[PDB]
Symmetry: C2
Subunit: 478 residues, 2 copies
Amino acid sequence: GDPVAVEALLQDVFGIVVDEAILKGTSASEKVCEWKEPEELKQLLDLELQSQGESREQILERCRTVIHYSVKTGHPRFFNQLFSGLDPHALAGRIITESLNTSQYTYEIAPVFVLMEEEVLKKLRALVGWNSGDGVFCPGGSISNMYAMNLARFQRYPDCKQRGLRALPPLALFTSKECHYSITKGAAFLGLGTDSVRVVKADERGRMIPEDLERQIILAEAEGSVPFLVSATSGTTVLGAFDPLDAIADVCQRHGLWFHVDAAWGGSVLLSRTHRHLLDGIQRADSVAWNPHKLLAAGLQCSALLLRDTSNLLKRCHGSQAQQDKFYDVALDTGDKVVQCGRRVDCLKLWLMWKAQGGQGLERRIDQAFALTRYLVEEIKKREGFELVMEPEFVNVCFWFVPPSLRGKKESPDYSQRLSQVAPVLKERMVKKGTMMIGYQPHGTRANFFRMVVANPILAQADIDFLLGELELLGQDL
Amino acid sequence: DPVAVEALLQDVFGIVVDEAILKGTSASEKVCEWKEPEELKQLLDLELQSQGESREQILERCRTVIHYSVKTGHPRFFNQLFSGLDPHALAGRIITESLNTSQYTYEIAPVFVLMEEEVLKKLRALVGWNSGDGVFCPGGSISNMYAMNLARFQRYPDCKQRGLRALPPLALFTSKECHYSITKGAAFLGLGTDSVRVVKADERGRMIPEDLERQIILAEAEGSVPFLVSATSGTTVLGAFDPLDAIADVCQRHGLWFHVDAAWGGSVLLSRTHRHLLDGIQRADSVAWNPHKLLAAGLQCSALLLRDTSNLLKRCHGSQQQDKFYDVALDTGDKVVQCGRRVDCLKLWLMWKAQGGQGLERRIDQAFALTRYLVEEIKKREGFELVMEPEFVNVCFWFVPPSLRGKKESPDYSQRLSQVAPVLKERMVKKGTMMIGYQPHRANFFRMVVANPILAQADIDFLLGELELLGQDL
Ligand code: NA
Ligand code: NA
């Protein structure tokens, strides 16, 4: 409780965070990762909790250690996930949130943030194209899609809330083959079962095929299942595709189906007049999942769920059966909207950055990410040994690195099997060297290829010249 | 510009220290700065615009957001089950937000992939298990939804693929003092609220094993298949603790999943004195435990522990070679249904390292002690009436105003008293001297929570003296 000791502690800890985590964490001169084999890091960390406390110095050193051996996700050469970058205003928002440590649950304990969330959700709905609606923030995009499924099930068969799924006919939902696994996880968690997820084929560019969607819908109807929801993707996690929302909307409307748009990754594109055409027709959706923590670098878990409904379907669905004595408009309380009880404050980090950058500052960051995606594509097409998997529609640049030993050997019967062995070796070498982290995955018959993500707001051409030169160095003997 | 970033955050942290941490823990300051919703909207000027704002305007927005927010760490904040500001946990939280990674793979979160297991390993130890599984979740409501789902999958693994229509009607059982997340989770998981069979609670708010087993037998007679029993070791209102060793016996006789919702009261396991309240918890299949509530770790410290050592957690929430260059068993992505997951272990681990097991024991024991002092002063003071003897740190009590003292036999005494707490709540919130919760159950009564680590007897003398002041004309 001693205030002077507390301030001195937090100020000392903040100095280590600033120097070692923020400044040194975003410097290209430092490493992205200080690799240690698990057991060696176990010993280095000395994690075992004990009965006796430790001195101030031993804790501050545990901070320096935790920072040092952690990956620097805000590094200009961190391309391993869909998120990248460390916005200082967002960080300022994050710190204020953790210090106030409240629950986004009632106006009584979170008055500022209960209103802030309403405004932010109102702006997001505007960028979607709605002048009215409902919505909530959720802990991750996976939960935003489970809400959408559940809301569709309840909107069509409200008895499900009480009698359960055994009182309903078999239900069928539809999503692209390029979806995030959160649809199949949510379907089983919601009791529908993985079989209830009918996969729709994607075209050459990774976009759902509206002709096959209805073909699936009609077949599902013929098997006894009842179509109720369609999930399009506006920014797949691998290729960065954008499903045709206006063509899928037509299909949903022709069958009176819930139209949900998983825009967790690509929904942030709606802030740029230049590239927002990629989500044309999204205003015809019933629900939209949108994670500004990915592209705008707001920090996890910035995950929103927007709804076009204006009848409190959200409260009637996730509400309970239990005030009439409180001294304020209880419409501000959002407890009946979610199935959670306590909920973090996830709007401040986004709102504060948005206040500092302005709508313009965030547009340029999106435009600046698309611009650098062109530069990366330029260098891949100009450089030998780098082969683009496909033309990128987003900031996801998928590409192989063909080492010298395989260039020209495409007609070899085992060309695929050996080329698939290249990225795993290049990934291991870059992590242990600590120079960069790039993701890679197989995609069906396609061999292990990289997946760059041009999203870090401090990225520069020099970083793309390095990672491309770095791969050439690390794969010269392959 | 590195210097601009450093100078920006350093200036922002100065505002956080003064207004949020120091002034937030000062008893001379207010707990809440009440503003009518419409006024606060205009005051805050939340509307987002095309043009950004200057550094000066941002720093001013920080102080304003802090000023009008509630001070959950104030010595006179008793509105929720959480209260207090552990500085070590706060340090961990800031380190967490700055490194901004996902508790998903050892590749991107090597330090925390190990840290979390050790913490979860210590929690399983305090439960009484030398082995098991577990993960952190975003709130205890999700910890109970996972537990429900794990039981459904463990008994009927075909459910994951074929759904609930491929299964017989399922029935779960819980006390009338359960968290409402049970009825929500049951509906969210597709079982339906009717699948939740309510069991009667005794005079102390505790589940009655005689009624539990009676319901189970009725469920079997109606065609349903009992599969799970959800006990509570620290209800949200009264602070009850179900008899875990008696319910375990019933679960044992019917081969049912025994889950213990210890989100609130699980922290008692750190005190040798008071851990007898959870005897039999080592006989559970699963246990939900939130260190953010009592220990002041900060939301969302909510764990889900398992006695299972057969990777039931991955087989249930997983997704269905890759060639990665390290033991992929370290990755915990298949354990949860989320994809990216926050790091919630550092704040607890750092505090536990600084306080030691003894320092955290000291806090729990001192919370029970201060809870007794509150009960002492309530029984000695006129106008304060205890609802029932508290077994935890939840002290439920009425305040009978002077106009109702001695009039207990009036036919409308109860109705008149139920109108007292709502007015005392409004007057304390608009005055800003303290925030105490109250709930309906006979008549609206208060629910103190002796959890703030910096609480003192002077604070208990104030809230009792303050209530008398706010209700002298009622
Ligand atoms: Na090329
Ligand atoms: Na009394």
